[PDB]
Design a protein around this nucleic acid. Structure first.
Ligand SMILES: Nc1ncnc2c1ncn2[C@@H]1O[C@H](COP(=O)(O)OP(=O)(O)OP(=O)(O)O)[C@@H](O)[C@H]1O
Ligand SMILES: *[C@H]1c2c(cc3ccc4cccc5ccc2c3c45)[C@@H](O)[C@H](O)[C@@H]1O
Ligand SMILES: [Ca+2]
Ligand SMILES: [Ca+2]
Length: 341
DNA sequence: GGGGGAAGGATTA
DNA sequence: GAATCCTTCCCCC
């Protein structure tokens, strides 16, 4: 299997740079202004000019303005990015039927039946970068290797506007030398447990009692890392099927008053139902973000599809169960639908 | 024992 | 911006 992964560079920010060329060169920051006060909210992403100074995805807008008070701050325009993303994804389908769209700006192509070696794969990578640059003027980074994980790692090492191949030999080298925290799917919580077990490389997972690893990070995570360590990871590139769809809305002020929360809840339902677009869910979950930012959720699965009216009455029951079983004030209230027919 | 499915919390980019 | 993962609990052959 030969996998080719594409990751659009600082995507949201780059799309804004494309719709407004004067932004190129300056530091650009795309935000999600929450609506609580003056500049409440967080940074969704920033271009490299801004990242040079520590302004990156995740930090509060307030902090970003203390680092770069003069950068360009743009409100996120998700619909526009999604549209551009759809177009670029269509460019990608002309290079392979087997394609896995992982997120708004990441996709995996199984090009095993299109190239004979990594040299041909690397050239197809350039072709793709050129085509996207030609049609949409967006630079992306290509990663290529024997499987999805290494193709992704390959792109992480080469971004921005890069391209890299990780042949079978370098895979073996990385299995011994790559910091295990840089492996896709290993986030902080998992990385800290591996450090506290003396595991810093994938290879280290081969010399520990399985049950001890499975006990600290879970069976799936353990089998996953072990299979990568043994150079036996080969998950196929499959089509992604959206499994849940929802919306959560931040309330004007945190509350525990059902009648005060209702309007927001119902808004989340209306939005979600639109997003569903012809999809009929059998399951619904009301999701609450408490004042201390913890997440409490209550759901229900029906034996038939949920109609909007049913979603209305059921979400209220579910909201009370949350209010009943938890005493904290609610900050954000939302809904999530799943188990489509 | 384990296939099968529902539910809630954990974890991730 | 949200979505999937993972672990536990339980019906039933
Ligand atoms: N708050 C966050 N913390 C950590 N990672 C985040 C956060 N927000 C977004 N990301 C990740 O960053 C990616 C978007 O980054 P972007 O395309 O804008 O520039 P990029 O850094 O080149 O992409 P990548 O993050 O894949 O390197 C998302 O796919 C994910
Ligand atoms: C948006 C938000 C937040 C946390 C996460 C955590 C992990 C994610 C993995 C993949 C996609 C994704 C999209 C939005 C996310 C994610 C992820 C919150 O910190 C934030 O409040 C928003 O909900
Ligand atoms: Ca990206
Ligand atoms: Ca990590």
């Amino acid at each position: 299997m030969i996998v080719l992964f594409v990751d659009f560079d600082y995507f949201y920010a780059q799309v804004e740079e494309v719709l407004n060329p004067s932004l190129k060169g300056k530091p650009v920051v795309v935000c999600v202004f929450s609506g609580r006060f003056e500049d409440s909210g967080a940074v969704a992403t920033a271009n490299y000019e801004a990242r040079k100074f520590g302004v990156k995805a995740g930090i509060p807008i307030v902090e970003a303005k203390k680092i770069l008070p003069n950068a360009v701050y743009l409100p996120m325009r998700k619909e526009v990015y999604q549209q551009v993303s759809s177009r670029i994804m269509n460019l990608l389908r002309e290079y392979s039927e087997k394609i896995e769209i992982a997120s708004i700006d990441e996709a995996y192509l199984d090009i095993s039946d299109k190239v004979r070696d990594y040299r041909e794969a690397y050239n197809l990578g350039l072709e793709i970068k050129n085509k996207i640059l030609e049609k949409e003027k967006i630079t992306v980074t290509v990663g290529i290797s024997k499987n999805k994980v290494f193709a992704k790692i390959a792109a992480d090492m080469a971004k921005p506007n890069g391209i890299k191949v990780i042949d079978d030999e370098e895979v073996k080298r990385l299995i011994r030398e790559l910091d295990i925290a840089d492996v896709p799917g290993i986030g902080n919580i998992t990385a800290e447990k591996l450090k506290k077990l003396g595991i810093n490389k994938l290879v280290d997972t081969l010399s520990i009692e399985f049950d001890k690893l499975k006990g600290m990070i879970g069976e799936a995570k353990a089998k996953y890392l072990i299979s990568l360590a043994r150079d036996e990871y080969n998950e196929p590139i499959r089509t992604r099927v959206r499994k849940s769809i929802g919306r959560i809305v931040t309330m004007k002020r945190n509350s525990r008053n059902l009648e005060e929360i209702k309007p927001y809840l119902f808004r989340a339902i209306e939005e979600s139902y639109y997003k569903l677009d012809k999809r009929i869910p059998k399951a619904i979950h009301v999701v609450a973000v408490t004042e201390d930012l913890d997440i409490v959720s209550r759901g229900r699965t029906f034996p038939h599809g949920i109609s909007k009216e049913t979603a209305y009455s059921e979400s209220v029951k579910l909201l009370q169960k949350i209010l009943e079983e938890d005493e904290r004030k609610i900050r954000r209230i939302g809904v999530r639908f799943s188990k489509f027919i």
